[PDB]
Design a protein around this ligand. Structure first.
Ligand SMILES: CCCCCCCCCCCCCCCCCC(=O)OC[C@H](COP(=O)([O-])OCC(O)COP(=O)([O-])OC[C@@H](COC(=O)CCCCCCCCCCCCCCCCC)OC(=O)CCCCCCCCCCCCCCCCC)OC(=O)CCCCCCCCCCCCCCCCC
Ligand SMILES: CCCCCCCCCCCCCCCCCC(=O)OC[C@H](COP(=O)([O-])OCC(O)COP(=O)([O-])OC[C@@H](COC(=O)CCCCCCCCCCCCCCCCC)OC(=O)CCCCCCCCCCCCCCCCC)OC(=O)CCCCCCCCCCCCCCCCC
Ligand SMILES: CCCCCCCC/C=C/CCCCCCCC(=O)O[C@H](COC(=O)CCCCCCCCCCCCCCC)COP(=O)([O-])O[C@@H]1[C@H](O)[C@H](O)[C@@H](O)[C@H](O)[C@H]1O
Ligand SMILES: CCCCCCCCCCCCCCCCCC(=O)O[C@@H](COC(=O)CCCCCCCCCCCCCCC)COP(=O)(O)OCCN
Ligand SMILES: CCCCCCCCCCCCCCCCCC(=O)O[C@@H](COC(=O)CCCCCCCCCCCCCCC)COP(=O)(O)OCCN
Ligand SMILES: CCCCCCCCCCCCCCCC(=O)OC[C@H](COP(=O)(O)O)OC(=O)CCCCCCCCCCCCCCC
Ligand SMILES: CCCCCCCCCCCCCCCC(=O)OC[C@H](COP(=O)(O)O)OC(=O)CCCCCCCCCCCCCCC
Ligand code: HEM
Ligand code: HEM
Ligand code: HEM
Ligand code: HEM
Ligand code: SF4
Ligand code: F3S
Ligand code: FES
Lengths: 31, 247, 120, 123, 116
């Protein structure tokens, strides 16, 4: 039960980090 | 052929062009040249040296001696510059005998056609889509319809646009998806929206009031920083935004 | 004429006005939560229950929830519009965003409106 | 073919990219956190379980990170609102930017000091 | 502009949701233990003491009423010949839909088990 919410926390951190690096990647790539 | 000319006082600056051949190989890449520099030189003089003596597949646009027309917008060391103005008089790191290198490459956002040459037709299509001409009645007054020296000094500072695209090709919103008009189209529409003797201000403001109009500006000042005429591109964009808010 | 007329102007204005309000709402929330008495180390059900026995904090939290969710949802709408290349991708991502935002607003509003201190 | 290169433009560009990143950060956190708070319509023990797992040193440094994100977003959003509503806004863009850099450093070192003394006395 | 496209899409999406909502409601009401023959105030009160069933019934109410109101808007638009008739029938529909949504939302939000 608590495990569900710590799983949710790490999933949120992964989505946050992915979005940060993806925004920077789309900024620097020439397409 | 015979031999390159004689230098006088040279620093032997290195250039790093980003070559791209459209047909012969489609194998682009960087290429480094070594050319002599002076205090009274410019990146245009150096690219001319490269094209005349060393290379000769290297193409780029340029017209004017120094009456600016805006044909040689490039990315020089990251920023957009108009290579005829980079003014190498200021090379103080030349004295410490460090190897100086300059990085040249086309502007970003438009389809490349060869080295340092891009396809300006998307830019000009966005330009001639804000209706950048005076729309009026249909029976001219034979004697130059009147306008005050107060109404005239309002759309000033946007009449200086030489249409070089140094601004539109530094807009991250323009690098992004969709079809943002761009700083330059919005400048050349501000010029006509704030002109007293015009009868399509409302129609232009309705063109700029779409999803890909003036509301996609993320208030980056890349355009203002890049303009070679010093136009305050983002303040023009702000004035159009406020004319849409308060009207 | 790609969407609803004058929707972008009002989304723009809403981001500005909700920012002005959210300064106070969100920063007062963070202050009172993290650096007032023991920060997180005082927080528990009894703390929540004695805070939500006050009209002040109830309205504060409901305004915070609604303003923050509509603000963030509009901002992410902009981000999706700037990063999605295919129209089908943009459609389904805007639908996922709308679904998640609606679910979060529904759950937060339910909890606030229905909270009772005496549950066990 | 895809070239990769950094534009190296205005400082307002880096302000905008930080603004976007921190905004998305707060949005995702808010989703997760409204859920775990909605756990209060279930049981005092459920709520205490979860928020007690939120009282660890890892989550404490994360609290500091989120404080930083929200604080920067608020300050830079004030700058953006001023640029948009104030008619002499776009002239003082870089002035506002330096001022909010100063305010951020002040308020954030203060907030880290307070949160840190709490974490110290808690261990 | 673009109101018909979104009304169309809403009918599709609310149909997908209403499959589960309405058919689960009908199942649990009519064919679980004694069907209608078990239903009374105590049954309603112990069902509405649960966040699950409270949110279920509020979602059912809102989705079903907006779905039906849009469908009847279409039906009126296809059967009413005079513009005055269409105007007053759309106004009657809007009034009845608003009244039903207001009453159902009031009852759900304000219901208390201990009334007498
Ligand atoms: C846990 C805490 C975290 C909080 C969560 C927050 C939740 C809300 C998030 C809101 C914002 C989302 C993310 C915003 C960042 C924007 C970045 C971006 O847009 O870059 C796009 C980027 C580039 O886009 P692109 O190059 O144009 O497209 C390339 C395609 O990937 C290549 O694909 P393709 O070329 O093959 O074609 C596109 C394809 C792919 O389309 C999509 O990408 C859609 C993805 C979303 C899933 C669909 C859910 C629909 C829900 C409908 C409800 C109404 O579409 C289709 O083929 C159609 C099939 C899809 C049908 C879906 C409907 C089925 C279910 C409906 C009935 C259900 C029955 C019950 O690539 C991405 O798509 C990345 C996706 C981002 C993942 C989401 C991250 C957060 C959510 C994770 C939750 C866990
Ligand atoms: C009990 C459970 C049941 C659930 C109930 C559900 C409630 C919501 C229902 C929603 C949908 C309604 C029905 C949908 C089916 C559509 C079928 C259809 O459209 O065929 C029309 C069909 C052919 O239409 P047509 O050939 O173009 O027009 C021929 C006219 O009949 C010939 O008339 P005309 O040529 O002489 O001129 C048209 C005339 C007739 O116009 C109408 O038909 C209007 C009828 C609705 C009554 C108005 C209520 C307005 C409420 C305003 C609130 C805001 O309009 C006028 O002359 C203007 C005077 C009306 C003024 C009304 C305002 C006064 C009160 C306002 C202030 C109140 C003070 C307090 O004939 C009908 O009109 C049948 C009417 C259907 C009766 C409604 C059935 C359900 C409601 C009964 C409740 C009990
Ligand atoms: C629990 C939740 C799970 C967390 C993840 C949520 C979002 C999932 C989206 C994909 C993420 C997988 C990684 C990836 O391949 O990114 C891809 C590229 O992004 C990057 O390069 C940086 C991301 C690395 C993340 C670093 C740590 C995070 C690890 C976990 C994630 C995303 O590619 P795309 O599928 O979204 O579309 C791509 C993209 O647009 C390319 O630019 C383009 O080349 C291509 O055509 C297109 O399809
Ligand atoms: C110099 C002058 C200053 C001007 C500009 C400064 C800009 C700095 C602001 C941006 C910093 C924060 C950006 C991202 C932070 C972050 O990633 O936090 C996430 C956490 O991600 C991490 O893992 C990072 C951990 C924090 C790092 C420590 C400090 C943050 C960065 C400091 C920057 C300098 C100040 C949040 O996770 P969560 O929402 O799930 O929290 C759940 C809490 N229960
Ligand atoms: C820290 C917490 C601060 C929160 C306060 C946020 C509110 C600031 C935004 C309000 C914007 C209102 C505005 O700027 O409008 C008028 C305010 O004009 C000003 O003079 C503003 C002067 C500077 C603004 C000072 C507010 C700063 C907020 C505190 C910053 C602390 C960080 C401009 O009028 P106008 O020139 O467009 O029209 C004139 C036509 N006759
Ligand atoms: C679109 C705009 C939406 C606005 C939403 C923003 C709301 C943000 C937070 C505001 C909360 C307001 C609720 C007030 C409850 C309260 O304070 O009252 C609750 C307080 C408890 O406050 P504390 O526990 O925090 O001390 O109870 C008291 O004992 C107060 C004593 C007298 C106070 C009188 C206030 C009654 C009404 C006067 C309102 C003043 C406004 C004046 C305007 C001209
Ligand atoms: C636009 C979208 C609108 C959405 C509305 C549709 C709602 C349809 C019905 C769903 C109702 C959901 C309310 C949940 C209440 C509940 O579970 O609680 C309801 C139940 C009581 O119902 P029962 O006794 O009949 O099973 O309570 C429990 O005993 C649950 C035990 C612990 C569960 C904790 C969950 C709390 C919140 C965490 C959610 C995690 C799921 C994540 C999914 C993304
Ligand atoms: C470390 C940081 C935070 C902590 C410890 C925290 C803690 C809490 C607590 C204890 C509550 C409910 C109790 C009460 O309101 O009195 C709550 C609810 C809430 N918080 Fe936070 N919070 C934090 C950050 C944030 C942030 C950054 C936001 C938004 C930007 C936010 C938005 C909300 C909202 C909207 C609610 C209402 C929940 C609901 O209505 O269901 N919080 N949070
Ligand atoms: C819960 C709190 C917040 C959330 C979830 C949030 C989320 C977002 C997101 C995702 C964006 C999009 C960024 C972009 O498009 O580049 C944004 C923009 C913005 N935010 Fe917030 N933000 C929050 C708080 C604040 C605060 C406190 C302010 C204070 C002024 C603020 C002011 C702004 C402004 C003005 C914008 C528009 C930026 C632009 O249009 O360029 N925000 N927000
Ligand atoms: C024989 C068939 C039905 C019976 C015996 C029945 C019975 C009930 C009962 C007992 C309740 C309230 C108690 C509770 O929800 O636990 C209720 C409420 C409700 N029912 Fe039904 N129902 C039937 C069919 C339907 C249908 C077909 C729909 C919609 C398509 C529907 C929609 C609703 C709604 C929206 C509520 C909420 C009432 C409110 O919020 O005031 N029901 N019905
Ligand atoms: C139970 C699952 C349901 C599904 C899957 C569903 C699906 C649909 C769909 C896709 C349409 C569009 C038909 C069209 O545009 O041609 C429709 C129309 C309609 N729906 Fe539903 N619906 C459901 C339940 C309901 C409920 C509960 C109501 C009313 C309370 C309702 C009332 C209507 C009406 C009146 C129409 C108009 C019919 C027409 O215009 O031809 N439906 N339904
Ligand atoms: S605005 Fe300044 S930069 Fe943009 S095009 Fe006209 S001149 Fe070149
Ligand atoms: S560069 Fe781009 S987004 Fe705004 S202010 Fe200048 S236009
Ligand atoms: S040469 Fe014409 S502008 Fe540089």
């Amino acid at each position: 039960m608590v495990l569900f919410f710590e799983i949710l926390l790490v999933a949120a951190v992964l989505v946050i980090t992915w979005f940060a690096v993806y925004a920077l990647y789309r900024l620097v790539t020439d397409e | 052929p015979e031999l390159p000319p004689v230098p006088e006082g040279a620093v032997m600056v290195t250039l790093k062009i980003a070559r791209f051949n459209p047909e012969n190989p489609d194998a682009a890449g960087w290429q480094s040249f070594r050319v002599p520099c002076l205090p009274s030189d410019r990146l245009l003089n150096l690219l001319h040296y490269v094209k005349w003596y060393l290379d000769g597949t290297l193409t780029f646009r340029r017209s004017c001696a120094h009456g600016v027309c805006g044909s040689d917008a490039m990315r020089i060391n990251g920023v957009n510059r108009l290579a005829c103005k980079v003014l190498m008089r200021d090379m103080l790191p030349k004295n410490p005998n460090k190897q100086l290198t300059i990085t040249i490459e086309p502007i970003r956002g438009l389809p490349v056609e060869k080295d340092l040459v891009v396809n300006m037709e998307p830019f000009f299509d966005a330009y001639r889509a804000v209706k950048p001409f005076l729309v009026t009645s249909g029976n001219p007054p034979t004697k130059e319809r009147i306008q005050s020296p107060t109404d005239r000094a309002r759309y000033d500072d946007t009449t200086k646009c030489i249409l070089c695209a140094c601004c539109t090709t530094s807009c991250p919103v323009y690098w992004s998806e969709g079809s943002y008009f761009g700083p330059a189209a919005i400048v050349n529409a501000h010029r006509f929206i704030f002109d007293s003797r015009d009868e399509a201000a409302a129609e232009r403001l309705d063109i700029l009031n779409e999803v890909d109009g003036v509301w996609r500006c993320r208030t980056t000042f890349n355009c203002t920083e890049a303009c070679p005429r010093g136009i305050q591109v983002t303040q023009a964009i702000q004035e159009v935004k406020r004319a849409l808010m308060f009207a | 004429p790609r969407g609803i007329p004058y929707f972008e102007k009002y989304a723009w204005l809403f981001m500005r006005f909700s920012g002005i309000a959210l300064v106070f709402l969100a920063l007062g929330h963070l202050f009172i939560m993290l650096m007032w008495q023991d920060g997180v180390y005082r927080i528990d059900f009894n703390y929540v229950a004695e805070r939500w026995a006050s009209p002040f904090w109830q309205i504060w939290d409901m305004a915070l929830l609604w303003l923050a969710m509509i603000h963030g949802a509009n901002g992410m709408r902009t981000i999706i519009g700037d990063y999605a290349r295919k129209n089908v991708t943009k459609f389904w991502l805007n639908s996922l965003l709308l679904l998640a935002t609606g679910f979060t607003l529904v759950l937060g509003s339910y909890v606030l409106v229905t909270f009772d201190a005496n549950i066990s | 073919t895809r070239r990769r290169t950094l534009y190296r433009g205005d400082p307002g560009m880096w302000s905008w990219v930080l603004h976007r990143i921190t905004g998305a950060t707060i949005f995702f956190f808010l989703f997760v956190h409204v859920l775990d708070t909605a756990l209060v319509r279930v049981s005092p023990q459920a709520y205490n379980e979860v928020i007690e797992t939120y009282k660890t040193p890892i989550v404490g440094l994360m609290e500091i990170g989120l404080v930083a994100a929200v604080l920067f977003h608020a300050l830079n959003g004030i700058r953006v609102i001023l640029i948009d509503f104030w008619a002499k806004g776009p002239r003082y863009q870089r002035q506002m930017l330096a001022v909010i850099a100063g305010l951020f450093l002040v308020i954030f070192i203060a907030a880290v000091g307070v949160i840190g003394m709490h974490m110290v006395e808690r261990f």
